[PDB]
Chains A and B, each alone.
Chain A
Amino acid sequence: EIQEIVKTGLWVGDCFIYTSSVNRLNYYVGGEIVTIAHLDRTMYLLGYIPKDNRLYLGDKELNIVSYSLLVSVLEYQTAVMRRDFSMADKVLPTIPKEQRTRVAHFLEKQGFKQQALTVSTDPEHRFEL
């Protein structure tokens, strides 16, 4: 059961990307809820059109807004969920600063403090691990 409520949602693979009533775009992996991104306003998932390389959102308007799904983050975290911590580390060169620390914290929550230590950019997170 997932913490952030699903106002609307979409399945990208077996991973569920949904909007939340917090305006949070989160994805469900593992039975764990991660925030892929923050929505600034209330948005609904029209669908994911591979052509545009985008997820198409709409406001109150019958027009288009687009969010590309942050696949590198999602794949890091998904791999972590599966208990493929090394695999998620291959993703890490393309996870930036603070995101490596976060993804590391994901890795850690699932378990393996050390692999999380190598990816975490932040020294403090390394130091605690």
Chain B
Amino acid sequence: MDSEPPSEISLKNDLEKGDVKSKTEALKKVIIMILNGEKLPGLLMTIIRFVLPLQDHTIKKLLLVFWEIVPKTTPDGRLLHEMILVCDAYRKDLQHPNEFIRGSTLRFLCKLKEAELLEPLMPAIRACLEHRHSYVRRNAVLAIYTIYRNFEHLIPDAPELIHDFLVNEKDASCKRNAFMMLIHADQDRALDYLSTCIDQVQTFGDILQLVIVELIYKVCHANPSERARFIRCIYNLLQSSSPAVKYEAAGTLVTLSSAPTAIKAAAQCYIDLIIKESDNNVKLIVLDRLVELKEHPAHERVLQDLVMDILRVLSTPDLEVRKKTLQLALDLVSSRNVEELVIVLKKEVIKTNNVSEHEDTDKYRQLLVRTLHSCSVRFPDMAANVIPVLMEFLSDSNEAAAADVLEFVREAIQRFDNLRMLIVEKMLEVFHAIKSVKIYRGALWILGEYCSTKEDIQSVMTEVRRSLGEIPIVESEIKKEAGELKPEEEITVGPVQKLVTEMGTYATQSALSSSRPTKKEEDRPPLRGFLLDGDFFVAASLATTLTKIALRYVALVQEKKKQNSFVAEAMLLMATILHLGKSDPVYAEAYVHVNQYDIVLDVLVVNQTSDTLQNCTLELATLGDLKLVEKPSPLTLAPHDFANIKANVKVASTENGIIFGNIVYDVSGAASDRNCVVLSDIHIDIMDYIQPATCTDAEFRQMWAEFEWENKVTVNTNMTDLNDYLQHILKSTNMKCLTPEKALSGYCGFMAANLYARSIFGEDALANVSIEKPVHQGPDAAVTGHIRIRAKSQGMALSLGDKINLSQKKTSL
């Protein structure tokens, strides 16, 4: 009988039957239905009658079982007395020669904090005063303590009965087996006795002595219990810069992340931390101790650095461990992050050296070039390293492989003015075999800026200019680029001037030069030719032309703040980006009142009628996410009764199977068809059910992408900013205004709120409230705001859309 709540009639029958097995099974079936929480008092006389005196342990044990989980509730066969049918003949049970029945009886009897059993539990310590097992003596210290807990904090429970009444706790210390139920409030002499016992311990018992009294002067003295306290005590005597090298903490710690890569990744972190405490700049974070595994002697054999190499990773162990490991290389050794990121990047970025680090997918290659290159932009020393490695990247000599390479290096030159003169000659080489945009773009920029340095350019450019591949974006990049630097410093059959001619043709003009350009018609609609066409005031010469622009870098460009940079090593970053970091007539009148922060729905129940409505009961219901914190409890609604009855309200619950409308309120009365009527007290909305939750800009952005929010409305009374009406109203449809999606200035400055919720509707809810408050001569519609809304199938989107207008209720009875 797993859980069957109607079966009590059969149990009575089964409980006495003249067959002992049946009786045991019955009583067992009662236990299992109560434990789940089901019907049990009908049976009581039957249950109690067979078992009572006997020394036959199994039925007695079963009855003994049922007296610690419901004795108080059941009363057919027990009623209320001092020597109840729980203990009257269980004084026999306590005083049987078999330890088990006595012991069991003692154990339940003393366990209860019952006051209708207080006297019978007190000399119940007799059953276990003699200690036939470790179990008997432990059973005794726990039972005396449980007696002490049960209203006997004074002389009824404190001395000895004949050996224990609160003194097993003392005795246990010096006896062969220990266990101290003495944790609080008990004899001082036993506490003292436990200390002595630390030495003459029994190990289970030591965990009991130890919860009470901890800290040792020793190293130990033995056993897991003492050992477990000991690592706590050690952390005290050296708190300083974490544990560093984990103590006896290490054993539990592995299981704490049994799923399976995460342990190594964590372990790797600690091992890296431990090596050294470095400068602790941007991603140079290694704490713990400065010297404890050093770094870097030149006589150390086979050195520290061997372990450091693991941390430099491509994936060399698996991805979770990889992400931890790349950060960890950066963390022990660099200048900041820059130094060790360049080494690390050199390995990752595409080459002709190894083909286990090159790939023909263009974005990844490109990104890897940008990561290597960002280190230079960060720190100078890296410029010198980067440029020759970049030329190796080029040497791959696939159209695309060159292409990616050329694209970053060209950015580097914008930063690094006439420093990378050397690269230009390498960069031209792979520009001729071509099937893509990227190669043309980049090459034309290097060869263009670099012209003073070289003289090749008609020849290199011209094979490509009459070759094909994909050429949209090529136009833009060649347009600003081709002439640049020194007015007449090249010549192969086209000097720098031919280049300016070319540069202009490629931009949007027409001219025979480099055997004509591939295309002329520019990239995306805004860019066009014209700016540059106007430009080249002084023909490709460092002055105030293309050259200027080329040998200068747009805004601030420093660090790895992503200003001509990309922020570490490209593969590690994907993982970091991913991390969102999300945090019968009846009359009612009613108002909601709050006194001393108690929120209640006031209801007055009125019988305007002369007719009888007796049988009157009042209930507030649990609909779904609405709940009663206590229904109105008066038996009112009688002939010409006016009553004030208070129903307390909650807003947060779990969905019930009954209707999901406004608030259900139920009054009952006389009638047999409609004994229960549902009638209303004032408004509560569907919107309550939504649950508020919040987003950060990353979670908002991810969800924006994840599912559409095209749906918009413009809501009146969003004249005001985010903070005022809009927040308060948004709150009531369990929403909250978080992070921005705005871009403010002297022409821009709609207020933008990123909203989130996680509705109990199987959807989230998100929105952006844009408040069109004029920051221009031509506003949208002046003050008002357009709320762009969604939910996960946009079923709550709509709630956001209208619950940001207005919202107010009041009455004054």
Contact = CB atoms under 8 A, between A and B. Distances in A.
Contact of B299 (A39, A57, A70): A70
A67 B300 CA distance: 6
B185 interface: no
A40 interface: yes
Nearest to B303: A40
Interface string A86-103: 000000000000110110
Contacts of A12: none
Contacts of B301: 37, 39, 57, 65-68
Contacts of B294: 38, 98
Contacts of B302: 40-41, 65
A69 interface: yes
Contact of A102 (B291, B300, B306): B291
B251 interface: no
Given A40-B302, A65-B302, A70 B297 contact: yes
Interface in B283-338: 290-291, 293-294, 297, 299-304, 306-307
**Binding site secondary structure of chain A:** mixed
A68 B301 CA distance: 8
Most central of A37, A39, A122 by chain B CB within 10 Å = A37
Contact of A37 (B290, B300, B306, B307): B300
Interface residues of A, number: 17
Contacts of B299: 37, 67-70
A65 B297 CA distance: 16
**Binding site secondary structure of chain B:** loop
A112 B294 CA distance: 25
Contacts of A102: 291
Nearest to B306: A40
Nearest to B293: A38
Interface string B395-428: 0000000000000000000000000000000000
Contacts of B290: 98, 101, 122
A122 B297 CA distance: 18
Contacts of A37: 297, 299-301
Interface in B647-697: none
Nearest to B302: A40
Nearest to B277: A98
A38 B300 contact: yes
A57 B291 CA distance: 24
A99 B291 CA distance: 8
A68 B300 CA distance: 7
B272 to A, nearest CB: 15
Contacts of A67: 299-301
Nearest to A37: B300
Contacts of A65: 301-302
Contacts of A69: 299
Contacts of B293: 38
Contacts of A122: 290
Contacts of A41: 302
A23 to B, nearest CB: 11
A38 B297 CA distance: 10
A126 B306 CA distance: 33
Nearest to B300: A37
Nearest to A124: B290
Most central of A40, A41, A101 by chain B CB within 10 Å = A40
A109 B627 CA distance: 70
Interface in A14-58: 37-41, 57
Contacts of A101: 290-291
Interface in B430-488: none
A58 to B, nearest CB: 12
A37 B304 CA distance: 11
A85 B297 CA distance: 24
20 contacts: A37-B297, A37-B299, A37-B300, A38-B300, A40-B303, A41-B302, A65-B301, A65-B302, A66-B301, A67-B299, A67-B301, A68-B299, A69-B299, A70-B297, A98-B291, A98-B294, A101-B290, A101-B291, A102-B291, A122-B290
Given A38-B304, A68-B301, 11 more contacts: A37-B299, A38-B293, A38-B300, A39-B301, A40-B303, A40-B307, A57-B301, A65-B302, A66-B301, A69-B299, A101-B290
Interface of A: 37-41, 57, 65-70, 98-99, 101-102, 122
Closest 8 CB pairs of A and B: A67-B301, A68-B299, A98-B291, A70-B299, A37-B300, A98-B290, A102-B291, A40-B302
